[PDB]
Amino acid sequence: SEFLLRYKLVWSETWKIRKQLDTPVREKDENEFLPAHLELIETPVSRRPRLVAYFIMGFLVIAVILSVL
């Protein structure tokens, strides 16, 4: 339609300027001792659930690839 064109234009405009929106990487202790709102804004997801999800997904992939052949 027309609105989707505007949304895609905005998305492309702010996706070309990408690599500037990212915050610097920080250790957990440095993230902890920040202003109250900034340490929610800038704290990334914990690493343990990411590894658990990756392990489950890889287990499924390995099971499929070993069962097919």
Partner: protein, 700 residues
């Protein structure tokens, strides 16, 4: 002349209850212009009477219990009494002529339209207040019991259709595919179509009716909550913040959102799911035992998870109330925030509070997700076990493929309400906490008055008897042994230094301050027992701040009685010396003043408040440093008009300057909470060593 009030007075005299017409008019004639039918019935119910308007034919008029009120559309009602047989005569009570008169059949038939009000004396003899809990809804369920029985019937029928629709799939699998089928398949198809469409219609009707009734119950609860909130003492509000009580009130909106939802219908579906269990056990008890053992697992998981979620939502509500308080205070005092440069501090506080609130919300979300995943795990484990056992049963015998499919669908229909409830666990616990917060507001004692009798109007006789008063339970004594007596129509001036205790008399005459020892009396009646509204509605007080409401000039001046004439408002404005500035405005008396009188200067709203106090007929009029905030050429008009304002009233003038009370009948001088001198102006000025003379010379 309002005849409904007179009829109510007469009918209350007949049924042995005392009624004060002024109090009933104050309570139930909020907008003036007569009582009206609904407010008349509410007022009659207030006097512990039983009234209801009925359609009664003249033939049936012989079998009702008289006296009864005939309500006409025009305000020309009349009380009917002694309908006489054998003479077709009626002994009405003419409300206009104020005496009984005898009528015959013809003029009564001309005067009677077909509606009459029956009055019965039903005074409940019971004194007790119940703690507000979840038990408050039991009388509401009893009152709305026809609707709930209707919804129970609809739920039973919905369960019947939901039981039917597995059976058609079972029949299809076991007969249409096994042998053959085309004639039976079409029959099953059309039957399934009608069953599903009627199930959808029934579910929609049940939701509609249940939502309507729960909305009405919530309206009743909200009305009760606001009544109780306005009936609370001022000490309740003085020790809290606005945002706290505001959040407590929006918990009502939370409750309303819950009531008109799918939670209670899902609970009904869950409790009415034993209909499926009969067919499930008929198919195979070995498979149904799995579901019967799974249900306690759901119950145990819910019981284990619920208290933690309740604690988390308690913390969430605490943070929400803090946020509401901070936001309301910041927006209300935005002028002070902008005048200074305290924006960074406010933003820092907001950031801290927002971070805390978001952390609490995330913890609540995490626990809700954990509970939902646990219930899903239990459901899936049960599904796997049933699949394995059903495979063995079908391979061995005593079970068919269609029977297994039907049993699987029945188990799914059993478990679906549990999943639907698990999706809204947060709402359940949030309502469990909303009820507690509404109780916290609703379990505070209101302004207590033992006297249920209707005291008459006030004559300006004020008496302080051994008054001892403290601001706080252990703060220094403000008034030690104040004894005073003021007669009707007497102008009293009270002066002294700041901190002498003369500022506590205004809030002691009104029932805002509770004396530690002694009693304050109006017309010989102790105020610790009288109804506060009776005292407040007859006492006019002008303070030094005098905040207004966000309305027009004439709405603020005539707030106590919107139905009064404009001319009296103009007269009151002229007396206060404010008409001129109001007129200089473009809209005149229709100018909106804004929040707390933002569109007017301090003296302007001071004069507006003086007019607002004078617009009624106050038996007692109090001036608590009213003219101190004003300037010259405005206080002079106030004094010139006060020469005739004090006519017929008991006026008390509490001022710092001794020139304000120069023309008073008495001048009471206070020093450190004790009355040291009293008398006229010259009688007090004669002694040069007195405190009054010292203050007069010092200020001069």
């Amino acid at each position: 002349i309002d005849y409904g009030l007179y009829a109510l007075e007469i009918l209350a005299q007949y049924h042995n209850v005392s009624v004060n017409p002024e109090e009933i008019k104050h309570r139930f004639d909020t907008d003036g212009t007569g009582l009206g039918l609904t407010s008349w019935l509410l007022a009659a119910k207030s006097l512990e009477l039983k009234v209801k308007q009925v359609k009664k034919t003249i033939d049936r008029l012989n079998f009702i219990s008289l006296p009864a009120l005939v309500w006409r559309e025009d305000g020309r009602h009349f009380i009917l009494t002694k309908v006489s047989k054998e003479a077709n005569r009626y002994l009405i009570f003419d409300l206009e002529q104020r005496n009984p008169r005898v009528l015959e059949q013809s003029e009564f038939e001309a005067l009677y339209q077909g509606h009459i009000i029956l009055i019965a004396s039903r005074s409940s003899v019971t004194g007790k207040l119940a703690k507000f809990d979840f038990t408050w809804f039991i009388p509401a369920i009893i009152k709305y019991r026809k609707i709930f029985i209707e919804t129970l019937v609809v739920s039973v029928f919905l369960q019947l259709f939901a039981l039917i629709t597995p059976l058609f799939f079972q029949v299809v699998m076991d007969k249409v595919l096994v042998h053959r089928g085309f004639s039976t398949l079409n029959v099953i198809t059309v039957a399934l179509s009608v069953v599903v469409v009627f199930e959808i219609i029934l579910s929609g009707l049940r939701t509609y009716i249940f939502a309507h009734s729960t909305s009405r119950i919530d309206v009743e609860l909200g009305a009760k909550l606001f009544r109780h909130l306005l009936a609370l003492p001022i000490s309740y509000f003085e020790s809290r913040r606005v945002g706290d009580t505001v959040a407590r009130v929006r918990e009502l909106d939370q409750i309303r959102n819950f009531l008109t939802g799918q939670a209670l219908t899902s609970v009904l579906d869950l409790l009415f799911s034993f209909i499926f269990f009969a067919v499930m056990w008929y198919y195979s008890p070995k498979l149904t035992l799995v579901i019967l053992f799974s249900l306690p697992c759901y119950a145990a998981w819910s019981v284990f998870i619920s208290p933690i979620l309740r604690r988390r939502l308690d913390d969430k509500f605490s943070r929400n109330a803090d946020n509401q308080s901070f936001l309301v205070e910041s927006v209300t005092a935005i002028n002070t925030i902008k005048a200074m440069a305290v924006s960074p501090q406010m933003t820092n506080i907001w950031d801290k509070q927002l971070a805390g609130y978001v952390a609490a919300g995330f913890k609540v979300t995490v626990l809700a997700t954990i509970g939902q995943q646990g219930i899903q795990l239990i459901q899936k484990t049960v599904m796997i076990i049933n699949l394995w056992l059903g495979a063995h049963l079908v391979i061995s015998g005593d079970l068919s493929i269609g029977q297994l499919i039907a049993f699987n669908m029945l188990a799914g229909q059993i478990v679906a309400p549990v999943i639907r409830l698990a999706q809204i666990w947060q709402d359940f616990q949030q309502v469990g906490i909303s009820v507690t917060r509404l109780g916290d507001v609703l379990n505070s004692p209101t302004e207590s008055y033992h006297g249920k009798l209707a005291l008459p109007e006030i004559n300006g006789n004020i008496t302080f008897r051994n008054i001892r008063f403290r601001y706080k339970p252990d703060s220094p004594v403000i008034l030690d042994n104040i004894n005073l007596s003021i007669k009707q129509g007497e102008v009293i001036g009270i002066v002294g230094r700041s901190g002498s205790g003369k500022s506590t008399l205004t809030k002691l005459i009104q029932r805002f301050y509770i004396p530690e020892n002694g009693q304050v009396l109006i017309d010989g009646h102790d105020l610790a027992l009288a109804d506060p509204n009776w005292l407040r509605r007859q006492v006019g007080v002008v303070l030094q701040d005098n905040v207004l409401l966000n309305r027009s000039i004439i709405d603020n001046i005539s707030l106590a009685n919107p139905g009064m004439s404009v001319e009296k408002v103009i007269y009151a404005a002229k007396l206060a010396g404010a008409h001129d500035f109001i007129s200089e405005l473009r809209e005149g008396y229709n100018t909106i003043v804004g929040e707390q009188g933002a569109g007017l200067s301090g003296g302007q709203r001071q004069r507006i408040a003086i007019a607002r106090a004078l617009v009624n007929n106050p038996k007692i009029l109090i001036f608590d440093e009213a003219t101190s905030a004003l300037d010259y050429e405005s206080e002079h008009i106030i004094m010139r008009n006060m020469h005739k304002i004090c006519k017929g009233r008991t006026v008390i003038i509490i001022a710092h300057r001794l020139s304000t009370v120069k023309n008073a009948d008495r001048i009471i001088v206070m020093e450190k909470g004790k009355i040291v001198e009293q008398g006229k102006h010259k009688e007090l000025l004669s002694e040069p060593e007195s405190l009054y003379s010292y203050l007069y010379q010092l200020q001069s």
